[PDB]
Amino acid sequence: PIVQNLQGQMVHQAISPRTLNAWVKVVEEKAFSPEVIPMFSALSEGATPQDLNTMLNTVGGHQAAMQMLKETINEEAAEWDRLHPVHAGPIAPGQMREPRGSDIAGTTSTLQEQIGWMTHNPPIPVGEIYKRWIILGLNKIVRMYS
Ligand SMILES: O=C(O)c1ccc(-c2ccc3c(c2)nc(-c2cn[nH]c2-c2cccc(Cl)c2)n3CCCn2ccnc2)cc1
Ligand SMILES: O=C1N[C@@H](c2cccnc2)c2c1n[nH]c2-c1ccccc1
């Protein structure tokens, strides 16, 4: 995630196995009950899309749920692309490109690009946006198994 240190500066750190273990735990012990959603939110504070994918990977064992999640993400990504079509052109040095749906999902973007967008002036909070899509997916999964 991207967190603030004591020197007021936003710095990146990899997702902690402590956090990952807590996520794996909530799912493996409660299996997509409604509780998994608030837990996912609590554990994903400041997360990059990369962090979120790491979290989702650790529970890839639940294949049906994971496919539902991936498809929800695809749909949300498409809607993002419909509403926010990317400026497909030359960009001057000092500037950076705009993210498409698959960039927000961390599929076609690097960690450095993700950090770049999250800390740009002005920013695009790609982690928060992706988290939104994932939570929509989690809600679908919770309904499915309700
Ligand atoms: O749902 C949300 O929470 C949500 C939804 C959308 C956005 C969003 C989307 C596109 C945005 C944006 C913010 N800020 C800018 C924006 C405005 N100036 N520069 C940028 C910018 C350029 C490159 C990389 C980054 Cl990092 C930012 N753009 C690019 C401007 C593209 N543009 C300009 C005019 N018409 C379109 C942020 C949050
Ligand atoms: O790089 C990645 N993109 C997403 C992604 C999203 C959608 C379709 N296909 C890839 C992703 C990645 N890794 N795990 C996952 C993932 C996403 C969802 C569930 C489990 C794993």
Q: Is 47 exposed, middle or buried (0-12, 13-18, 19+ CB in 10 A)?
A: buried
Contact 62, 32 (CB under 8 A): yes
Ligand 1 mean position to 98 CA, how many Å?
7
Q: Which tokens sit at 118? A: 């999250």
Residue 101 phi/psi, 5-degree rounding, is -55, -50
Helix (H) or strand (E) segment spanning residue 54: helix 49-57
Pick among 1.10.730.10, 3.40.47.10, 3.30.499.10, 1.10.375.10: CATH of 1-146: 1.10.375.10
Structure resolution, Å: 1.7
* Nearest-ligand number for the alpha carbon of 122: 1
User: What technique determined this structure?
Assistant: X-ray
Ligand 1 mean position to 91 CA, how many Å?
15
| Any ligand 2 atom below 6 A from CB of 67 | no
Domain residue ranges in the chain: 1-146
| Any ligand 2 atom below 6 A from CB of 70 | yes
Where residue 20 falls (left for φ over 0; alpha for ψ -120 to 50; beta otherwise) is: alpha
Closest approach atom of ligand 2 to CA 77: 7
